[PDB]
Enzyme design. Structure first.
Site, PDB file in Angstrom:
ATOM      1  N   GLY A 136       3.130   5.997  10.445  1.00  0.00           N
ATOM      2  CA  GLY A 136       4.522   5.858  10.062  1.00  0.00           C
ATOM      3  C   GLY A 136       5.144   4.527  10.439  1.00  0.00           C
ATOM      4  O   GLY A 136       6.286   4.253  10.033  1.00  0.00           O
ATOM      5  N   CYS A 183       4.044   1.479   9.542  1.00  0.00           N
ATOM      6  CA  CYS A 183       3.862   0.407   8.574  1.00  0.00           C
ATOM      7  C   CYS A 183       5.202  -0.085   8.046  1.00  0.00           C
ATOM      8  O   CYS A 183       6.138   0.694   7.830  1.00  0.00           O
ATOM      9  CB  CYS A 183       2.978   0.868   7.420  1.00  0.00           C
ATOM     10  SG  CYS A 183       1.335   1.300   7.962  1.00  0.00           S
ATOM     11  N   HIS A 208       0.802  -1.219   0.000  1.00  0.00           N
ATOM     12  CA  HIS A 208       0.000   0.000   0.000  1.00  0.00           C
ATOM     13  C   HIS A 208       0.838   1.272   0.000  1.00  0.00           C
ATOM     14  O   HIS A 208       0.266   2.368  -0.087  1.00  0.00           O
ATOM     15  CB  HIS A 208      -1.009  -0.005   1.157  1.00  0.00           C
ATOM     16  CG  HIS A 208      -0.424   0.100   2.538  1.00  0.00           C
ATOM     17  ND1 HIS A 208       0.335   1.171   2.961  1.00  0.00           N
ATOM     18  CD2 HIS A 208      -0.595  -0.689   3.630  1.00  0.00           C
ATOM     19  CE1 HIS A 208       0.655   1.010   4.234  1.00  0.00           C
ATOM     20  NE2 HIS A 208       0.103  -0.110   4.664  1.00  0.00           N
TER      21      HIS A 208
HETATM   22  N1  LIG Z   1      -2.354   5.324  11.602  1.00  0.00           N
HETATM   23  C1  LIG Z   1      -1.754   4.066  12.018  1.00  0.00           C
HETATM   24  C2  LIG Z   1      -1.675   3.723  13.363  1.00  0.00           C
HETATM   25 CL1  LIG Z   1      -2.301   4.777  14.665  1.00  0.00          CL
HETATM   26  C3  LIG Z   1      -1.091   2.518  13.697  1.00  0.00           C
HETATM   27  N2  LIG Z   1      -0.627   1.711  12.780  1.00  0.00           N
HETATM   28  C4  LIG Z   1      -0.683   2.013  11.499  1.00  0.00           C
HETATM   29  C5  LIG Z   1      -1.245   3.198  11.065  1.00  0.00           C
HETATM   30 CL2  LIG Z   1      -1.320   3.593   9.321  1.00  0.00          CL
END
Ligand SMILES: Nc1c(Cl)cncc1Cl
Ligand SMILES: Nc1c(Cl)cncc1Cl
Ligand SMILES: [Cl-]
Ligand code: NA
EC number: 3.4.19.12
Lengths: 306, 305
Positions: B143, B145, B41
C-alpha cells in the site's frame, strides 16, 4: 520490510509554530486556538539566569512587551499568564490551522517526534524517547527553545514536550505543555546534572520482536529465564528493570511471533553476554531502545516473515 | 548539541498526497497543479504484472476508471497519459495547497526525506540515502507505492523519488518524478535483485566531522595521507572512491575543525583497519554513511524552512 526511526508527519505542528520575542530574546511558541505557549524563561535577562523570580519579572511586563510573529504576520497579545514553567499568551486571533489536539504527560521510555524550530520556522523532524533519567537525546542549537514534541493518533496531535534547556552532558530537558518539567530539573542556570542513564529494557525487547517479524532469528536461544533472574542480570548492564506491566505490554508481539516474553528475555541476556559477533540486528550493531512496543506494531507488518 | 537523523518538515508534501484507485488496487498519488502522479503499475492486475504491455493496458482504461480521493473529496479525472514509469492523471481542480516545487533527479550518496503513505494518508517521515546500488533502505509495507521522497530548499520542494517496489532483500526501488527508475530495475514481476552495495565514503567523513563538532574526538590521530593511498584502502574495504570534488565539498568542515580531509581520511583508514576498539562515535558502533556534508552543515547551523 525495513525498519527506520520514523517520525510522525509534521505538517499539523508546523501550522502552529510562531516566534515569541521579549526584549532581546527570541524563541519559539506553540499557537493553538487563541493561546501561544512558550518557555517562561523568555522573560529572563542576563541577570535572571541563576535565581530568577518569575513572578516578579512577569508582573513588570505588559501585553505589548511580547512580540508574537506568525509567519509574516504580527499577532496582538491581549493577555498573559504563567502556568508552572510555561507562559501562556492570549492573542487576538485563533489559529486557523489548529489541529485536533490534546496535552499528554508521558512516562520514561515513551517516544515522540520533535519538530526542531528556530525563529518560529521549522528546521527538521526526528524521533526521541524520554530517557529513564527524564532527559532526551535531541538535536538542539541556540534558539530552539519552545520547539515541541508530539505524537499523532487519528489526526489528533498529542503534545507531550516543550524544549527548555541543554544540560552540560549535551542532553536536553523540558516540560509538558502544562509547564511541569520532566525529571528534577528547573529553569535556572545553577549546576544541575542528569542522573546516570539506563537502557529501556522493554523497548529493546520490542525491537528484538521487530527483528523477528522482519525475518531474523539468529539471536534466539533454547533457554528461558524467570523474570527475577532476568532483572538480576540486566541491571548489571545498566538496563532498567522489566516489570509485569512490561511483560503484559509485550503480549501482542509475543503472540505474533510465537516467542514467549521470558524466552525473548533469555535471548537478550545472551546478547548482553556475547555481543553481536560481527552481526547486526535491523542494521544496528548496538541494541536499540528507542522503539516502543506500540512503535513496533505501528511500523512492522502484522505478518511475520517466517 | 546533539546529532540526529533528521527529516525535512513534511507539511508541504502532506498537502499533496492523494489516494488513487484503479480496479482492486489502491495506492498513493502526488497532486500538484491539476495533475496526479502515481506509479504506472497501478493499472496492472497480478497477471498483467508478469509481463505488462503498459500502453496496451492503458487504452482499455478510461478517465472514470481512476478513482482519486483527496482526503474526503473525490477528484474527477479528465485526462491520462504516461511518462516513462509514472502515470499522469489530469484532474479538473488544481491543488490549492501546491507548494513551490521542482522535479529533480538525485545522485547516489545524496539524502532525502520520505513521506510514507497508505491510502493517500501520510503515516510517517524518515530520512533515506540513495545507495550506490540505486536502492534505498526504506521502511514500506504493501500500500506504500506512490509515497515520495524530497528535499526542501527555502520554500521550494525538490521531489526526487516515487516508491514503486520492494526487492527480495527488503530494500526498495523507485523512480524520479519523471518516471525514470533509479537503478537497473523494471516495473514488472520478474527476477530482480539489489547489486552488491558499497559505503558512501564522503558521507562517512562528513559524519566524522559531525562527531568532532559534537565533542567525539577519540579517533583523531597525528597522521595524514594522500588521495591515492586512501583510495587503495577504500577499495579494499568496499568504500566508494574519494575524489578531489569530495575533498573540496568537505573543505568548510576541515577549516572549522582543523582536521584536513586527508587528516580525517587517516582517522578513517585507521578505523577501517583496526575497528572501533569497543568505542562508539555519536552513539554508533558502525560508521554511518547517510549524512551528506550539507546535512552535517545544516544540522550544525540551524537552517529552517
Ligand atoms: N509489498 C510491498 C512492500 Cl512490503 C513494500 N513496498 C512495496 C510493496 Cl508493493
Ligand atoms: N543553547 C541551547 C539552548 Cl538555549 C537550547 N538547546 C540547545 C542549546 Cl546548545
Ligand atoms: Cl603522516
Ligand atoms: Na590524522
Amino acid at each position: 520490510s525495513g525498519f527506520r526511526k520514523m517520525a510522525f508527519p509534521s505538517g499539523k505542528v508546523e501550522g502552529c509554530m510562531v516566534q515569541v520575542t521579549c526584549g532581546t530574546t527570541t524563541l519559539n511558541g506553540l499557537w493553538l486556538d487563541d493561546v501561544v505557549y512558550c518557555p517562561r524563561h523568555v522573560i529572563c535577562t542576563s541577570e535572571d539566569m541563576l535565581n530568577p523570580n518569575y513572578e516578579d519579572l512577569l508582573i513588570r511586563k505588559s501585553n505589548h512587551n511580547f512580540l508574537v510573529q506568525a509567519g509574516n504576520v504580527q499577532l496582538r497579545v491581549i493577555g498573559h499568564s504563567m502556568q508552572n514553567c510555561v507562559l501562556k499568551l492570549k492573542v487576538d486571533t485563533a489559529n486557523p490551522k489548529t489541529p485536533k489536539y490534546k496535552f499528554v504527560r508521558i512516562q520514561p521510555g515513551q517516544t515522540f517526534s520533535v519538530l526542531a524550530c528556530y525563529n518560529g520556522s521549522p528546521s527538521g523532524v526526528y524521533q526521541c524517547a524520554m530517557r529513564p533519567n527524564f532527559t532526551i537525546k535531541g538535536s538542539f542549537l541556540n534558539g530552539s527553545c519552545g520547539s515541541v514534541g508530539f505524537n499523532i493518533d487519528y489526526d489528533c496531535v498529542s503534545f507531550c514536550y516543550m524544549h527548555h534547556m541543554e544540560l552540560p552532558t549535551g542532553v536536553h530537558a523540558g516540560t509538558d505543555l502544562e509547564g511541569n518539567f520532566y525529571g528534577p530539573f528547573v529553569d535556572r542556570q545553577t549546576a544541575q546534572a542528569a542522573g546516570t542513564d539506563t537502557t529501556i529494557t522493554v523497548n529493546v525487547l520490542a525491537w528484538l520482536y521487530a527483528a523477528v517479524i522482519n525475518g531474523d532469528r539468529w539471536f534466539l536461544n533454547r533457554f528461558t529465564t524467570t523474570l527475577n533472574d532476568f532483572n538480576l542480570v540486566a541491571m548489571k548492564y545498566n538496563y532498567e528493570p522489566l516489570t509485569q506491566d512490561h511483560v503484559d505490554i509485550l503480549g501482542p508481539l509475543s503472540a505474533q511471533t510465537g516467542i514467549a516474553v521470558l524466552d525473548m528475555c533469555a535471548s537478550l541476556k545472551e546478547l548482553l553476554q556475547n555481543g553481536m559477533n560481527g552481526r547486526t540486528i535491523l542494521g544496528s550493531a548496538l541494541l536499540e531502545d528507542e522503539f516502543t512496543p506500540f512503535d513496533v506494531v505501528r511500523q512492522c507488518s502484522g505478518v511475520t516473515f517466517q
